Design a protein around this ligand. Sequence first.
Ligand code: 99T
Lengths: 198, 204
Amino acid sequence: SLTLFHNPASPYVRKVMVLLHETGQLNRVALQASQLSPVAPNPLGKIPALRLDNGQVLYDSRVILDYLDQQHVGNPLIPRDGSARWRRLTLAALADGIMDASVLVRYELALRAPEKHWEQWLDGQRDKIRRALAVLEAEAIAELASHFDIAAISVACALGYLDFRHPDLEWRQDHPQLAAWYFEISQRPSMLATRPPV
Amino acid sequence: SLTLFHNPASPYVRKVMVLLHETGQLNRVALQASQLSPVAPDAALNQDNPLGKIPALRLDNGQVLYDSRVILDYLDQQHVGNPLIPRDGSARWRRLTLAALADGIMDASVLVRYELALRAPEKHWEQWLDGQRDKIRRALAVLEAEAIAELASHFDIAAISVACALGYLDFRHPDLEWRQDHPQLAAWYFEISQRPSMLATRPP
Ligand SMILES: N[C@@H](CCC(=O)N[C@@H](CSCCC(=O)O)C(=O)NCC(=O)O)C(=O)O
């Protein structure tokens, strides 16, 4: 079968796992436990990475999601053409950017020695997250609710990661519509099954 | 019109500019200059891309696309020549994976630039810097070992992305040697650097 190089904490892996659940493809993929190397190091250790039967490996998560969305016969979760394609992919990119910034803040606080922390840098990354959440609340609520697709899955996983690694960034208070949407989609079997450990 | 947030230093912007040049679409896209960093944001950019990153592409109706991969995907469908991103089949995912390899080199290279140029020297995290150096080297080794013929076969999304990553290494990290251990990649890069699209999009 397909082998997915996997880690249960990664929000980028989670996107893939949620799509697999949602599209009924989970039983087609074997999860290979894979080691994180955030400080210093599937020869490139890409996570997620998807190995096909010829030994060739696909990455990163966006490429893997694109591939997997074409292997099932249900409604596509990534629009194949038209304005909706780039709108949903931009919303997904917005979510990926929330993840990128969240991961940078996490790696700094969890892995860099305190003496080497840079507050202006950390605040700059926090600001990206705040600005992105504001856009979602102001512009994207109806859009997210319309279809649990590439955009909704990516945002959901970004929000899950914020709760997981950054509980002290309270985001529900200033984004109540996003909070209500998230509470609901959090109960989907795909989301329940893919929560990060501890 | 279309408006692209732009500077000549960014290799992600460069991928877009190279595609525009290769596909004959430059005269459709206005450039809006952006100077920015995570500690010095562009407030005009932030109103369009809340992540505060370039490229971002404002469409005629004011809808904004980002990040670079989304913009490349859109622009590749706005010309009637051979696509630079395969739209069907195994080739799509191989070429996009190679592009992702290149984007990984760029991502690491940019984080290293910000560490060395912006963060105070006494706060430089040597062990992480070493890690990033190694991650870049391993990616280059994979290109050298596995992808040379593939890159030379078509100057497409994969070739453009790799080329922009190499240009960025030379630009921001000239003291990081990459040619010595990757001669086939170096030779390919020397050849495609002579393409008009590459010559026209060099960093300052
Ligand atoms: N995923 C995005 C990444 C884009 C990206 O990181 N762009 C960089 C400039 S590269 C040039 C840095 C330099 O001056 O050397 C950028 O906008 N940095 C601003 C910031 O992170 O605040 C994409 O693919 O478009």
